[PDB]
Design a protein around this nucleic acid. Structure first.
Length: 88
DNA sequence: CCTGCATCCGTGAAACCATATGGATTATTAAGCAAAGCTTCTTTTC
């Protein structure tokens, strides 16, 4: 379904903020322009801000859990250091 | 002067005035923004 399109969204976000290029995620319209030029596609077309908030909105809680769990896999070296000093 | 004793010092187990002043705080406004809502094009139904 659309869940796979969201998977490529967060994966491109993972590469994007992983390679020290941050400022293009927090602003939204330029980010959607970036996603449209790299050629992601939900239902045969480009991405609208309404369409973006729908596809983020129309979404299941367990799938969201799956997406953040998949997202945390690249950022493992940060989290091991993060929790090694919090084992109280 | 140099051999010979003493010791002793270390060492561990008040109030105000005045005057700037600028930095800190508050108000005030332009920008912007997410969310909503027209307007037309497809898409699905009988």
């Amino acid at each position: 379904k659309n869940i796979d399109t969201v998977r490529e969204i967060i994966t491109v976000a993972s590469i994007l903020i992983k390679f020290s290029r941050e400022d293009i995620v927090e602003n939204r319209a330029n980010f959607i322009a970036f996603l449209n030029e790299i050629g992601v596609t939900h239902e045969g077309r480009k991405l609208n801000q309404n369409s973006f908030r729908k596809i983020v909105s129309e979404l299941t809680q367990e799938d969201k859990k799956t997406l953040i769990d998949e997202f945390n896999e690249g950022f493992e070296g940060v989290y091991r250091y993060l929790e090694m000093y919090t084992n109280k």
